[PDB]
């Protein structure tokens, strides 16, 4: 949510500004900023976009090659932050402590993703402060299947740069 560092994602579809919650999600925020500061997210894509749900990125190139990330981090989904529209959270696999570089932006209120009695859920670590219209736009682009992935934009939506703002 409202934490401290701001990050600008400049995409081929427009700009999205993030505010990261360093107080509630210290490990997730540090992890994310290290990826941005190292240039990791430059030329990755939003490889999975689902209208009325979310858009996910930070892992693959245009050619759907997967970049090699750093080691996985502990899940901070029990920090009280919820997966409401306009928040950013960490994607992961089956194990709760499996998140690496991939993140998603909620374009709707997705409470079934929240930490709860049935599942540990997905860690929220910031919010979109500018450019939700862009996030909406990206979620609505034509998609198709590539390899084992569905909902891949037919025309790649590229993160051309990601930078921590002063």
Contact 81, 87 (CB under 8 A): yes
Q: What are the beta bridge partners of residue 7?
A: 18, 164
Q: What resolution in angstrom units was achieved for this structure?
A: 1.7
| Two structure tokens written together for 85 | 């529209």
Alpha carbon distances (Å) from 106 to 81, 83, 135 = 13, 7, 9
On the 0-12 / 13-18 / 19+ scale of CB atoms within 10 A, 106 is: buried
Task: Characterize the bridge pairing of strands 124-130 and 87-90.
Answer: antiparallel
Rounded distance between C-alpha atoms, residue 118 and residue 127, angstroms: 25
Task: Characterize the bridge pairing of strands 158-164 and 44-45.
Answer: antiparallel
Q: What are the beta bridge partners of residue 149?
A: 146
**Structural domains of the chain in order of their starting residue, each with its CATH number:** 1-166 (2.40.100.10)
Terminal Cα-to-Cα distance of the chain (whole angstroms): 18
Rounded distance between C-alpha atoms, residue 3 and residue 22, angstroms: 5
Question: How does DSSP classify residue 155?
Answer: S
């Amino acid at each position: 949510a409202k934490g401290d560092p701001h990050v600008l994602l400049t995409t081929s579809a427009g700009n999205i500004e993030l505010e990261l919650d360093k107080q509630k999600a210290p490990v997730s925020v540090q992890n994310f900023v290290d990826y941005v500061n190292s240039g990791f997210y430059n030329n990755t894509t939003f490889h999975r976009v689902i209208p009325g749900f979310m858009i996910q990125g930070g892992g693959f190139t245009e050619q759907m090659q997967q970049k090699k990330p750093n080691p996985p981090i502990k899940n901070e989904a029990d920090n009280g932050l919820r997966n409401t529209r306009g928040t950013i959270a960490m994607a992961r696999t089956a194990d709760k402590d499996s998140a690496t570089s991939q993140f998603f932006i909620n374009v709707a209120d997705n409470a079934f993703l929240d930490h709860g009695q049935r599942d540990f859920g997905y860690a929220v670590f910031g919010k979109v402060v500018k450019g939700m219209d862009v996030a909406d736009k990206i979620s609505q682009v034509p998609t198709h299947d590539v390899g084992p992935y569905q909902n891949v934009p037919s025309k790649p939506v590229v993160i051309l740069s990601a930078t921590v703002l002063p």
